[PDB]
Copies of this chain bind each other. A is one copy, B any other.
Amino acid sequence: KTNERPIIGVLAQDVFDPKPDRNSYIAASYVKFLESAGARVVPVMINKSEDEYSRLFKSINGVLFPGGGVSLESSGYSKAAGIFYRLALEANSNGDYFPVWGTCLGFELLTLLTSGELLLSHTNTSGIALPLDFTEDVKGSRLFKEFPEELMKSLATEPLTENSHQWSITTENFTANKKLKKFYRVLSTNTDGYNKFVSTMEAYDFPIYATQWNPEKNAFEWTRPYIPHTPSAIKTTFYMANFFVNEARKNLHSFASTEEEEKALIYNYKPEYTGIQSAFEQTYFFN
């Protein structure tokens, strides 16, 4: 029994210099990423009540924590994400399957929510397209199970994954942390020549997935020259999203009504063209 009308939440985040109609934002490339794999999208607002979030949590079928440049510890984004994290652990523990996806900053947030500490160190990874150095553990993984063999090989040898991050967790700090090591299976790593860091992971016992790299950009973002756009880069971004959305298809929540559904969808919002200057072609701004 699957849910073939999956709806996924994407978290908004605190805007660097806030003002009316501009307190938070979501980059359109995260919306496109999900929609391409057959999901509809609900922008989740920052600084809302806990009851509001459980309302939303019980209505949607998955959440994605996107990249960005906002505090892991005291932002609207980090508060909301923590609430979604806890709701997800609990729902899943009780057999209500509910997938959570962490991209870049969202990955880092995940290390914090699960470990309870900040374990990040600096990496020369601000603007570089990389292959993935798979671990031996990818062989049984959930994330990469449905990927074509051909694409798996390309991903190992081709610069298909975009990194635009200043911070990482070294495999050493990740392995040194007991909460992380017990919880997450590491599927690939990368290095900048000195630092070896965790690049893709999935929880052992929860449908929680995270990449330090930004899978959504290969199809959808064109304004920086270290975004890969080869044919295999384009498939990589489809197949990642496809896996996440097929995880969302195992969740059976729905909105209380079609009217509540319609009022929540990203379709009520129009994005701004921000590509002349930003890394983002288009961004959604919220009050």
Contacts and interface: CB of A to CB of B under 8 A. Distances in A.
Interface of A: 4-5, 17, 32, 35-38, 40, 48-49, 51-52, 55, 74, 122, 124-125, 127-131, 148, 159, 163, 190-194, 218-220, 222, 225-226, 229-231, 233-235, 237-238, 242, 245-246, 249, 256-260, 262, 265, 267-268, 270-271, 273, 275-276, 281-282
Identical chains in the assembly? 6
A124 B192 contact: yes
Given A124-B124, A238-B242, A267-B275, 18 more contacts: A5-B222, A32-B32, A38-B218, A38-B219, A38-B233, A49-B259, A52-B258, A55-B257, A55-B260, A122-B225, A124-B192, A190-B193, A192-B192, A192-B193, A231-B242, A231-B246, A234-B242, A267-B281
Nearest to A4: B229
7 contacts: A37-B219, A48-B259, A52-B260, A124-B193, A124-B226, A159-B194, A191-B193
A257 B49 contact: yes
A65 B259 CA distance: 22
Contacts of A218: 38
A267 B128 CA distance: 25
Nearest to A197: B193
